[PDB]
Amino acid sequence: TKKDRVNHCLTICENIVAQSVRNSPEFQKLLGIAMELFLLCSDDAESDVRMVADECLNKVIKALMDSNLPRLQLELYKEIKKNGAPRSLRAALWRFAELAHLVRPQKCRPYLVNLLPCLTRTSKRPEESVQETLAAAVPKIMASFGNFANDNEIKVLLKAFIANLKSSSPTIRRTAAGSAVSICQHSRRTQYFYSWLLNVLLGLLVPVEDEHSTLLILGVLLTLRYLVPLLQQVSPSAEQLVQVYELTLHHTQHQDHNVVTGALELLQQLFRTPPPELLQTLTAVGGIGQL
């Protein structure tokens, strides 16, 4: 049935694209069935089945990217809504992000509301392949839906991703850092959330003397490194920035070389693109003694 499954999907692959009418009521139902079959066929034991299902997954999308994009977005999201197999979810997730920017502004608010639980729920998935897909899907989705989000809604997503900063897996620990920074970058109040994220990240480590998990230290230090370039112009203050610089200097003396190299990377990111308030402090003869 291996050849049957490939041929059957390939049969519906060419059938749906080579069809004169693209708005008949039967076409909408048939497109949904054809869509979900490809996602289902995207997670099969035979590898060649998978490179055929996904190849026709976007071949149908490219052909119908103009006539029936709203229907394709609904079908792609319906797969993400049902948290399923890692290969099928990440197959729908990485395509929904690509077509996210083609949604008209009148439909960007309902999608964001429905997609907020999906982004939080998918962050809990421990697979290192799902996290990699979500690491790329969040910047694309936020860049198209971020401005339609309430101030508390951004806080919900940030708190969900911050909880993954202490994970053992670097892929989970790096996806959380990238997504958290990118969520703030594409929000309405970019400067407000930059300061809001900065104190939250600092509050996770600013009790310097007390013990902190090495996993948490690596997660926060990476998040600051992703946030430093975007701080180059309420808003983050020179007191917050100098606190980050002091946090970096302390952690270069850690025992774990991963922490040492993690903080050292942040230190060079600070010096490559220094925020103007911190740069004035670091260059003044009395720089931090005044503060």
Angle between the 25-41 and 47-63 helix axes, to the nearest 10 degrees? 150
Residue partners of 18: CB distance under 8 A and separation at least 6: none
Instruction: Please name the residue that has the structure tokens 């004035």.
Output: 280
Provide the resolution (angstroms).
2.7
Going by C-alpha positions, the residue among 20, 14, 67, 12 that lies closest to residue 36 is 12
CA dist., res. 277 & res. 236, Å (int): 9
Question: Which tokens sit at 221?
Answer: 């230090």
Question: CB neighbours (10 Å) of residue 210?
Answer: 7
- Give the CA radius of gyration of the chain: 23
- The whole-angstrom separation of Cα 259 and Cα 248 is 10
- The residue among 21, 24, 58, 26 whose CA lies nearest residue 39 is 58
- Using CA atoms, how far apart are residues 231 and 149, in angstroms rounded to an integer? 21
Contacts of 222 (CB under 8 A, 6+ apart): 173, 174, 177, 262, 265, 266
Q: Could you count the other beta carbons within 10 Å of the beta carbon of residue 57?
A: 22
202 and 250 in contact (C-beta within 8 Å)? no
